[PDB]
PDB file of C-alpha atoms in Angstrom:
ATOM      1  CA  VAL A  30       0.000   0.000   0.000  1.00  0.00           C
ATOM      2  CA  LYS A  31       0.962   3.659  -0.418  1.00  0.00           C
ATOM      3  CA  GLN A  32      -0.003   6.391   2.038  1.00  0.00           C
ATOM      4  CA  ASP A  33       1.301   9.618   3.548  1.00  0.00           C
ATOM      5  CA  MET A  34       3.852   8.375   6.086  1.00  0.00           C
ATOM      6  CA  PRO A  35       6.956   9.885   7.704  1.00  0.00           C
ATOM      7  CA  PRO A  36      10.215   8.329   6.462  1.00  0.00           C
ATOM      8  CA  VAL A  37      12.007   5.355   7.985  1.00  0.00           C
ATOM      9  CA  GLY A  38      14.406   7.479  10.019  1.00  0.00           C
ATOM     10  CA  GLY A  39      11.742  10.036  10.896  1.00  0.00           C
ATOM     11  CA  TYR A  40      11.933  13.791  10.582  1.00  0.00           C
ATOM     12  CA  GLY A  41      14.811  15.888  11.847  1.00  0.00           C
ATOM     13  CA  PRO A  42      15.006  18.012  14.968  1.00  0.00           C
ATOM     14  CA  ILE A  43      13.092  21.296  14.809  1.00  0.00           C
ATOM     15  CA  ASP A  44      14.134  24.334  16.837  1.00  0.00           C
ATOM     16  CA  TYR A  45      11.371  25.633  19.101  1.00  0.00           C
ATOM     17  CA  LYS A  46      13.134  27.696  21.803  1.00  0.00           C
ATOM     18  CA  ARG A  47      13.903  31.404  21.787  1.00  0.00           C
ATOM     19  CA  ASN A  48      17.278  32.496  20.382  1.00  0.00           C
ATOM     20  CA  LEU A  49      18.223  36.093  20.971  1.00  0.00           C
ATOM     21  CA  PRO A  50      21.765  36.912  19.788  1.00  0.00           C
ATOM     22  CA  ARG A  51      22.854  39.502  22.419  1.00  0.00           C
ATOM     23  CA  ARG A  52      25.029  41.973  20.549  1.00  0.00           C
ATOM     24  CA  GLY A  53      26.681  45.412  20.462  1.00  0.00           C
ATOM     25  CA  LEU A  54      29.402  47.011  22.559  1.00  0.00           C
ATOM     26  CA  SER A  55      29.440  47.427  26.314  1.00  0.00           C
ATOM     27  CA  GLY A  56      27.971  50.704  27.550  1.00  0.00           C
ATOM     28  CA  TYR A  57      31.391  51.961  28.640  1.00  0.00           C
ATOM     29  CA  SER A  58      32.498  51.706  25.001  1.00  0.00           C
ATOM     30  CA  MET A  59      29.730  53.894  23.564  1.00  0.00           C
ATOM     31  CA  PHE A  60      30.108  56.334  26.470  1.00  0.00           C
ATOM     32  CA  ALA A  61      33.840  56.626  25.730  1.00  0.00           C
ATOM     33  CA  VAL A  62      33.160  57.020  21.992  1.00  0.00           C
ATOM     34  CA  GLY A  63      30.630  59.789  22.635  1.00  0.00           C
ATOM     35  CA  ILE A  64      32.932  61.572  25.087  1.00  0.00           C
ATOM     36  CA  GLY A  65      35.846  61.392  22.642  1.00  0.00           C
ATOM     37  CA  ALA A  66      33.689  62.728  19.809  1.00  0.00           C
ATOM     38  CA  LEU A  67      32.558  65.544  22.120  1.00  0.00           C
ATOM     39  CA  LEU A  68      36.167  66.436  22.958  1.00  0.00           C
ATOM     40  CA  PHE A  69      37.260  66.343  19.302  1.00  0.00           C
ATOM     41  CA  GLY A  70      34.361  68.568  18.256  1.00  0.00           C
ATOM     42  CA  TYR A  71      35.093  70.965  21.121  1.00  0.00           C
ATOM     43  CA  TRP A  72      38.757  71.254  20.101  1.00  0.00           C
ATOM     44  CA  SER A  73      37.979  71.808  16.407  1.00  0.00           C
ATOM     45  CA  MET A  74      35.275  74.381  17.189  1.00  0.00           C
ATOM     46  CA  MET A  75      37.692  76.142  19.564  1.00  0.00           C
ATOM     47  CA  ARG A  76      40.386  76.450  16.889  1.00  0.00           C
ATOM     48  CA  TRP A  77      38.009  77.588  14.150  1.00  0.00           C
ATOM     49  CA  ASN A  78      36.242  80.111  16.403  1.00  0.00           C
ATOM     50  CA  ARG A  79      39.583  81.650  17.386  1.00  0.00           C
ATOM     51  CA  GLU A  80      40.528  81.916  13.700  1.00  0.00           C
ATOM     52  CA  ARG A  81      37.126  83.469  12.938  1.00  0.00           C
ATOM     53  CA  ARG A  82      37.655  86.043  15.699  1.00  0.00           C
ATOM     54  CA  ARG A  83      41.039  86.933  14.185  1.00  0.00           C
ATOM     55  CA  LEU A  84      39.474  87.368  10.733  1.00  0.00           C
ATOM     56  CA  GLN A  85      36.663  89.510  12.170  1.00  0.00           C
ATOM     57  CA  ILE A  86      39.227  91.721  13.933  1.00  0.00           C
ATOM     58  CA  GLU A  87      41.105  92.109  10.630  1.00  0.00           C
ATOM     59  CA  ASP A  88      37.912  93.091   8.782  1.00  0.00           C
ATOM     60  CA  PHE A  89      36.936  95.559  11.528  1.00  0.00           C
ATOM     61  CA  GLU A  90      40.344  97.246  11.441  1.00  0.00           C
ATOM     62  CA  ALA A  91      40.057  97.520   7.646  1.00  0.00           C
ATOM     63  CA  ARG A  92      36.676  99.209   8.173  1.00  0.00           C
ATOM     64  CA  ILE A  93      38.206 101.577  10.744  1.00  0.00           C
ATOM     65  CA  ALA A  94      40.975 102.487   8.293  1.00  0.00           C
ATOM     66  CA  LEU A  95      38.397 103.093   5.548  1.00  0.00           C
ATOM     67  CA  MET A  96      36.049 105.266   7.674  1.00  0.00           C
ATOM     68  CA  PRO A  97      37.411 108.876   7.290  1.00  0.00           C
ATOM     69  CA  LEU A  98      37.024 109.136   3.499  1.00  0.00           C
ATOM     70  CA  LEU A  99      33.434 107.877   3.720  1.00  0.00           C
TER      71      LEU A  99
ATOM     72  CA  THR B  26       4.495  21.014  32.461  1.00  0.00           C
ATOM     73  CA  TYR B  27       4.200  24.759  33.069  1.00  0.00           C
ATOM     74  CA  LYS B  28       6.591  27.699  32.815  1.00  0.00           C
ATOM     75  CA  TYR B  29       6.693  31.250  34.182  1.00  0.00           C
ATOM     76  CA  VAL B  30       6.695  33.821  31.386  1.00  0.00           C
ATOM     77  CA  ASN B  31       8.053  37.192  32.602  1.00  0.00           C
ATOM     78  CA  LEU B  32       9.389  36.077  35.989  1.00  0.00           C
ATOM     79  CA  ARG B  33      12.978  37.305  35.784  1.00  0.00           C
ATOM     80  CA  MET B  34      27.019  48.716  38.627  1.00  0.00           C
ATOM     81  CA  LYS B  35      27.824  47.162  35.243  1.00  0.00           C
ATOM     82  CA  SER B  36      24.220  46.104  34.575  1.00  0.00           C
ATOM     83  CA  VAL B  37      22.834  49.478  35.693  1.00  0.00           C
ATOM     84  CA  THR B  38      25.363  51.276  33.472  1.00  0.00           C
ATOM     85  CA  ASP B  39      24.446  49.012  30.541  1.00  0.00           C
ATOM     86  CA  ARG B  40      20.744  49.752  31.067  1.00  0.00           C
ATOM     87  CA  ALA B  41      21.427  53.499  31.269  1.00  0.00           C
ATOM     88  CA  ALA B  42      23.542  53.344  28.104  1.00  0.00           C
ATOM     89  CA  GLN B  43      20.725  51.461  26.367  1.00  0.00           C
ATOM     90  CA  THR B  44      18.350  54.201  27.552  1.00  0.00           C
ATOM     91  CA  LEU B  45      20.525  57.061  26.294  1.00  0.00           C
ATOM     92  CA  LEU B  46      21.946  55.466  23.118  1.00  0.00           C
ATOM     93  CA  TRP B  47      18.939  53.319  22.038  1.00  0.00           C
ATOM     94  CA  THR B  48      20.572  49.899  21.620  1.00  0.00           C
ATOM     95  CA  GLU B  49      17.436  47.780  21.143  1.00  0.00           C
ATOM     96  CA  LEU B  50      15.860  50.419  18.902  1.00  0.00           C
ATOM     97  CA  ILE B  51      18.958  50.107  16.692  1.00  0.00           C
ATOM     98  CA  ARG B  52      18.497  46.317  16.782  1.00  0.00           C
ATOM     99  CA  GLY B  53      14.874  46.605  15.636  1.00  0.00           C
ATOM    100  CA  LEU B  54      15.871  49.072  12.923  1.00  0.00           C
ATOM    101  CA  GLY B  55      18.546  46.622  11.794  1.00  0.00           C
ATOM    102  CA  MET B  56      15.945  43.886  11.435  1.00  0.00           C
ATOM    103  CA  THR B  57      13.713  46.297   9.489  1.00  0.00           C
ATOM    104  CA  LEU B  58      16.628  47.054   7.146  1.00  0.00           C
ATOM    105  CA  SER B  59      17.232  43.302   6.870  1.00  0.00           C
ATOM    106  CA  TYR B  60      13.670  42.857   5.628  1.00  0.00           C
ATOM    107  CA  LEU B  61      14.215  45.771   3.229  1.00  0.00           C
ATOM    108  CA  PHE B  62      16.985  43.927   1.344  1.00  0.00           C
ATOM    109  CA  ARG B  63      15.141  40.641   0.692  1.00  0.00           C
ATOM    110  CA  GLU B  64      13.207  39.451  -2.344  1.00  0.00           C
ATOM    111  CA  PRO B  65       9.506  40.398  -2.055  1.00  0.00           C
ATOM    112  CA  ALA B  66       6.941  37.623  -2.438  1.00  0.00           C
ATOM    113  CA  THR B  67       4.618  39.544  -4.788  1.00  0.00           C
ATOM    114  CA  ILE B  68       3.558  37.292  -7.675  1.00  0.00           C
ATOM    115  CA  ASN B  69       2.870  39.090 -10.957  1.00  0.00           C
ATOM    116  CA  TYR B  70      -0.888  38.776 -11.249  1.00  0.00           C
ATOM    117  CA  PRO B  71      -2.545  38.289 -13.746  1.00  0.00           C
ATOM    118  CA  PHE B  72       0.492  36.959 -15.611  1.00  0.00           C
ATOM    119  CA  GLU B  73       1.253  34.694 -12.627  1.00  0.00           C
ATOM    120  CA  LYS B  74      -1.149  32.624 -10.541  1.00  0.00           C
ATOM    121  CA  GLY B  75      -0.987  31.380  -6.975  1.00  0.00           C
ATOM    122  CA  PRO B  76      -0.483  27.691  -6.223  1.00  0.00           C
ATOM    123  CA  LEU B  77      -3.576  25.513  -5.987  1.00  0.00           C
ATOM    124  CA  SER B  78      -4.576  21.867  -5.584  1.00  0.00           C
ATOM    125  CA  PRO B  79      -6.485  19.351  -7.741  1.00  0.00           C
ATOM    126  CA  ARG B  80      -9.204  19.340  -5.037  1.00  0.00           C
ATOM    127  CA  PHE B  81      -9.940  23.061  -5.492  1.00  0.00           C
ATOM    128  CA  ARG B  82     -13.579  24.094  -5.022  1.00  0.00           C
ATOM    129  CA  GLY B  83     -14.527  26.593  -7.719  1.00  0.00           C
ATOM    130  CA  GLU B  84     -17.233  26.914 -10.370  1.00  0.00           C
ATOM    131  CA  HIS B  85     -20.085  24.418 -10.589  1.00  0.00           C
ATOM    132  CA  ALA B  86     -20.132  22.241 -13.703  1.00  0.00           C
ATOM    133  CA  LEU B  87     -22.179  19.385 -15.155  1.00  0.00           C
ATOM    134  CA  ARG B  88     -20.034  16.656 -16.705  1.00  0.00           C
TER     135      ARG B  88
END
């Protein structure tokens, strides 16, 4: 006879339990990365703001030199 | 026979870092982006038809 039957060795194991990976860095790592990015941005903004102040002083002194003719 | 669902400084710092930096939200977004890059299961109707069976119950006919 022929009928719907599982095979001679049966069917294989089937996973039925939860599997969460558990991934990412430790919280100290992202805190250190954020703090380092903050410090780098602070340093770059400091340098560029000082340069901008120097350029503004230069432009203002050019204006002061140009004033009497106007 | 039965099981208890929902009966469960480093750990506190990890929880605070997950709060501030959104670790599990990034995980869920990563799974969303994983489902973005797969092949969609939309069959091109009417040029394609869904699978059926020889026992399908459709239109009445007299043989």
